[PDB]
Design a protein around this nucleic acid. Structure first.
Lengths: 144, 116, 102
RNA sequence: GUCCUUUGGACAAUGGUAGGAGAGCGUUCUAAGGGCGUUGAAGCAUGAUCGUAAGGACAUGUGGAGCGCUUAGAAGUGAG
RNA sequence: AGAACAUGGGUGAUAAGGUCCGUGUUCGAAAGGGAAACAGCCCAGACCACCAGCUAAGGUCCCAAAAUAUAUGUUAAGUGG
RNA sequence: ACCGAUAGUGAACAGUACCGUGAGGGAAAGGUGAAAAGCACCCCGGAAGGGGAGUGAAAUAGAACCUGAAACCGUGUGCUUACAAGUAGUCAGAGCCCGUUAAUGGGUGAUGGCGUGCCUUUUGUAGAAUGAACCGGCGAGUUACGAUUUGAUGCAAGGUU
């Protein structure tokens, strides 16, 4: 005086549903990353995991702007000599678009062990159908 | 007369070795490495006593901002409105009330809001 | 039920019957100190003091004037032969609330 | 420090290498005065104690004959 | 044994993180914030405590605090003719 | 107002062990107890070594014998650990186990933030520049005589042998 709530321990996590139709990849991505992070709770501490689950289901009506489809190559290396591989944004969205969305969510999260855990509260589906009815998921609308 | 370099040397070295307790391996057992770590940690503590103040202010501001968007307002706009109302409550106080009594926090938000 | 007082250079949330630690006050042990600067009254009826609440006193009884846990302040510079070492204990006063007025 | 000098109300000040100035802490030995010790000295080990720092106590266990304090003096007087 | 920077000049090639003078600043001997990291650049000079407040340079979508703020315009290029 | 066994003689038990063709060089190594009363006897064992029992104020005083630090090596246990990227600390902080020179108590620590050892030498060193395996002991502005300048004290046209 130390009069200060920190002990989030024993928190209450909920379940959310966002849909991807006609949104921008980055902007949806940043709002979802904030929810998974827990930045919207008056009770927020960075050392324990507050924050809650997010379900993305259309993941095929993702919208780019400009020439993102042919540009925006993605790269990876296999640690094997000359082993650089690549794929362009449009055909990654056309085959495995779930990877397209979850990669750009997880690139917006801390790369600690807590952050890689918070990225595991994410479920992405191409098409408007998901299995999680026992969790009682609620619709959330992008409050930009 | 002749002095011996006697019992004083151990006492001085044993204080540092005790003060290095809990460190890893040689860090808590050997005097030269323990002395280095015990002076390194003393310089860490100075810097980190300064850093606590700014860390908790950052946390208080982020929790008030979370509480503000619930009542459809931004942190910056809220604090400006409170300044114009004259309210003298504090970042830490504003977080502790917003966590314990939401109904007291809502009246503050309305007075901060029609002050604008 | 709870009040906000501004004492020392800091603000504290208090309730009837709890213990607080503040910067030193000119008082002796046993006495009763009364706080003036009240900023918020969180009761059934809520009073907001944008400057002050105009009234609003909090009563407390002094017990244990004391001096705090000791910290060693140590700093050094690497290949320069300068270092400094000193000790500090901060004084405090311990209080228990009995009254929240308005 | 400063100066009204109520030495307190203020007017202050207080990063630092070569280097200059000040004030102190501990070690061994001597003088004088007072102390302690087989109902347990010095040394060793542990503790959550005290002092602004160098450092000082006290309790307990081990040890089995020596050792503090106050004022002064003299140095083979402090190691990474 | 000095160093970088901006401005005035010689030398060199209107070269050099080159070299030689002059006028300032900073490092040397200076912790803190910004420039990703980064003695010498921008802001600023640490007696000690605090889970108080206002600001500087730089900033306010996520990492990572603070405007997905207004009103009004340019850009379609993504980061010798 | 000299040293106390790395000191003081090289030498407290030696010009010896040892080294060299020779002239020659040249160490390390003190301590049972007041008194040997220095452990009769039984048990395991080829023995060494141990376990009892005994003597003693005391055998973790038993000859490797006063005390017995640290490095280093072990046995047991409270908390913690097999998705994790590191100068190993510091600041925050749950969970579990405790109970002190009782006091804003102690141990350990999921998880978050920040963070390139020390000394030397350099314009500039995390530096891939130097030095140090670790721990213990020892290891570097001194004294004599003169000179100058400060402080103190006595006497003063004198002062001092």
């Amino acid at each position: 005086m130390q009069t200060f709530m920190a002990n989030e321990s024993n928190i209450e996590r909920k379940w959310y549903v966002i849909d991807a139709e006609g949104q921008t990849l980055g902007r949806l991505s940043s709002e979802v990353a904030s929810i998974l992070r827990g930045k919207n709770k008056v009770t927020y501490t960075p050392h324990v995991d507050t924050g809650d689950y997010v379900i993305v289901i259309n993941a095929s009506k993702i919208e780019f702007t400009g020439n993102k489809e042919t540009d925006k190559v993605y790269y990876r290396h296999s640690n094997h000599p000359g082993g650089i591989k690549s794929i362009t944004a449009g055909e990654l969205r056309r085959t495995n678009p779930e990877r397209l969305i979850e990669n750009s969510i997880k690139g917006m999260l801390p790369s600690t062990r807590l952050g890689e855990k918070q990225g595991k509260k994410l479920f992405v589906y191409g098409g408007a159908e998901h299995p999680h009815a026992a969790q009682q998921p609620e619709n959330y609308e992008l409050r930009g | 007369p002749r002095v011996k370099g006697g019992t004083v040397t151990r006492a001085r070295r044993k204080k540092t070795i005790k003060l290095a307790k809990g460190y890893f391996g040689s860090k808590h057992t050997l005097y030269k490495v323990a002395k280095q770590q015990v002076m390194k940690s003393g310089q860490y503590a100075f810097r980190d006593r300064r850093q606590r103040k700014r860390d908790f202010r950052k946390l208080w501001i982020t929790r008030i901002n979370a509480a503000a968007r619930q009542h459809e307002m931004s942190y910056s706009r809220l604090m400006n409105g409170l300044k114009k109302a004259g309210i003298d409550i504090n970042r830490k106080m504003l977080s502790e009330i917003a966590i314990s009594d939401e109904k007291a926090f809502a009246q503050l938000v309305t007075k901060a809001k029609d002050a604008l | 039920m709870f009040a906000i007082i501004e004492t020392g250079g800091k603000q504290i949330k208090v309730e009837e019957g709890q213990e607080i630690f503040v910067e030193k006050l000119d008082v002796n042990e046993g006495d009763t100190f009364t706080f003036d600067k009240v900023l918020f009254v969180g009761g059934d009826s809520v009073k907001v003091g944008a400057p002050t609440v105009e009234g609003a006193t909090v009563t407390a009884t002094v017990n244990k004037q004391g001096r705090g846990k000791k910290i060693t302040v140590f700093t050094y510079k690497r290949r320069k032969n300068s270092k400094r070492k000193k000790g500090h204990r901060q004084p405090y006063t311990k209080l228990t609330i009995d009254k929240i007025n308005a």
